[PDB]
Amino acid sequence: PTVDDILEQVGESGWFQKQAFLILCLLSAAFAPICVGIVFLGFTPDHHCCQDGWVYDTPGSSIVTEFNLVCADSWKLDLFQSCLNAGFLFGSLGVGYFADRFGRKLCLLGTVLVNAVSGVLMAFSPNYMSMLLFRLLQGLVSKGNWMAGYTLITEFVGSGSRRTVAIMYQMAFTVGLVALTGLAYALPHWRWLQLAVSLPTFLFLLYYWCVPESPRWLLSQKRNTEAIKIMDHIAQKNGKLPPADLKMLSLEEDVTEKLSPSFADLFRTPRLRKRTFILMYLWFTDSVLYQGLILHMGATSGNLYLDFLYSALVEIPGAFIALITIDRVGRIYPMAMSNLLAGAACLVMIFISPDLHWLNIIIMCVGRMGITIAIQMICLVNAELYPTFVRNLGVMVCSSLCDIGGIITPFIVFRLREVWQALPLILFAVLGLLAAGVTLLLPETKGVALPETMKDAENLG
Numbered sequence: 302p303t304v305d306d307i308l309e310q311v312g313e314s315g316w317f318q319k320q321a322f323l324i325l326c327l328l329s330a331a332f333a334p335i336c337v338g339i340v341f342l343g344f345t346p347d348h349h350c351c352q353d354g355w356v357y358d359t360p361g362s363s364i365v366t367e368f369n370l371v372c373a374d375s376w377k378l379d380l381f382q383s384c385l386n387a388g389f390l391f392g393s394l395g396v397g398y399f400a401d402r403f404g405r406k407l408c409l410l411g412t413v414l415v416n417a418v419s420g421v422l423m424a425f426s427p428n429y430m431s432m433l434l435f436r437l438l439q440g441l442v443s444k445g446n447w448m449a450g451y452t453l454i455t456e457f458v459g460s461g462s463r464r465t466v467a468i469m470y471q472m473a474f475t476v477g478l479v480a481l482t483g484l485a486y487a488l489p490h491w492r493w494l495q496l497a498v499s500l501p502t503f504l505f506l507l508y509y510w511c512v513p514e515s516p517r518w519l520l521s522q523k524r525n526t527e528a529i530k531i532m533d534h535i536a537q538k539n540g541k542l543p544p545a546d547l548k549m550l551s552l553e554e555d556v557t558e559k560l561s562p563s564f565a566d567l568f569r570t571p572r573l574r575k576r577t578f579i580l581m582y583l584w585f586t587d588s589v590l591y592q593g594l595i596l597h598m599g600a601t602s603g604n605l606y607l608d609f610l611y612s613a614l615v616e617i618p619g620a621f622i623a624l625i626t627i628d629r630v631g632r633i634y635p636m637a638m639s640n641l642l643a644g645a646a647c648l649v650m651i652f653i654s655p656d657l658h659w660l661n662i663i664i665m666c667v668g669r670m671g672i673t674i675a676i677q678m679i680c681l682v683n684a685e686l687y688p689t690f691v692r693n694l695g696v697m698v699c700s701s702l703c704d705i706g707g708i709i710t711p712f713i714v715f716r717l718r719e720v721w722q723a724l725p726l727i728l729f730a731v732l733g734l735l736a737a738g739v740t741l742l743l744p745e746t747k748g749v750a751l752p753e754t755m756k757d758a759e760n761l762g
């Protein structure tokens with residue numbers, strides 16, 4: 302009588318779960334401005350390049366118009382993204398035990414309050430060093446918020462709807478990007494845009510007090526009283542009678558009362574070590590090949606609004622395709638096919654002359670669908686292939702190996718565009734195709750109802 306059976310008897314997609322998913326959807330739209338937002342507000346309109354300073358003629362005011370970073374400190378924007386991505390690295394190494402042991406829901410609430418305060422302080426920051434440190438904190442806190450929220454969603458949802466609710470969460474992320482574009486068009490000033498982004502965070506915390514904790518992680522602490530309380534509250538919420546308390550409670554005496562995120566037992570079991578290595582390779586791929594592809598995309602009209610509108614309308618067809626095909630053939634074959642398609646798209650620009658009609662749109666479309674389907678696979682698979690005391694140690698393969706991609710892709714492309722114009726495409730295609738062909742074949746399996754039964758990490762092998 303695992304908690305999934307209790308949720309099934311109480312209704313996995315009841316009204317209470319609907320409002321909880323709405324609340325964390327409101328959280329999801331608050332994560333896009335942290336990562337995607339920069340291309341809008343940190344965008345130089347024009348540069349005059351004695352010099353005698355530089356003046357940009359545009360009604361909007363970006364970060365570089367107000368800090369004068371056009372020529373003397375042009376690399377500061379790269380330094381700014383490097384500092385944000387090092388914030389992601391600091392989060393990946395930091396919010397583990399510090400994100401679980403103090404109370405998972407309470408940690409999420411404290412961090413979302415911290416994010417609100419730090420964003421408001423970014424709105425009123427009349428310097429640069431404080432701005433950089435605050436962006437470090439913003440990156441760390443926002444990554445922690447989004448991963449904790451997503452894993453909480455895949456914890457509440459019972460077996461049979463994890464794919465649906467997670468893919469709807471990613472659709473909410475894409476809708477957050479679309480709303481970012483809309484609010485960007487609403488007013489070009491970065492200050493008011495940041496202040497308007499910070500208000501969904503208030504709307505989150507204001508109503509986030511009533512959301513309960515994760516029942517399974519709470520059961521992992523051998524505290525089943527309030528766990529049974531919250532399960533019966535959920536059951537009575539969506540018009541259902543409570544189940545048997547003894548069946549609902551699972552003692553699981555072999556489980557440690559506290560958590561010990563393994564820094565050395567990850568490689569103890571060969572299945573877990575192999576899964577972690579495969580996910581490391583796959584994650585590196587993903588942002589690697591990605592910002593790579595984005596960079597290789599042509600100049601979109603407008604370059605600040607229609608660029609985002611065209612980039613965001615890619616995901617939603619991909620999200621719907623994933624929703625349709627993720628269960629009929631499992632969560633391995635569709636994403637493997639998408640990655641092979643992305644590799645073939647990367648390899649086709651080299652041997653085919655660009656003068657052919659519609660070649661640019663064909664390659665951009667195929668690559669992008671491939672590395673949207675890859676991302677909406679890998680997030681769900683990393684969430685599924687880790688128990689509750691390993692999922693927060695499972696964020697590191699998500700974020701401590703995508704951070705290296707985000708840091709290093711500008712340098713790799715900067716060297717590649719000089720050494721050989723045909724070099725970066727061959728490198729990206731070779732690494733992506735070889736990795737996604739050898740790997741992503743058997744990273745355990747899919748369709749497993751119990752991810753944190755103390756035997757999920759070993760029985761699948």
Ligand SMILES: CN(C)C(=N)NC(=N)N
Binds near residue numbers: 337672673
């Ligand atoms: C948010 N960033 C930078 C991504 N990795 N996007 C993506 N799904 N390739």
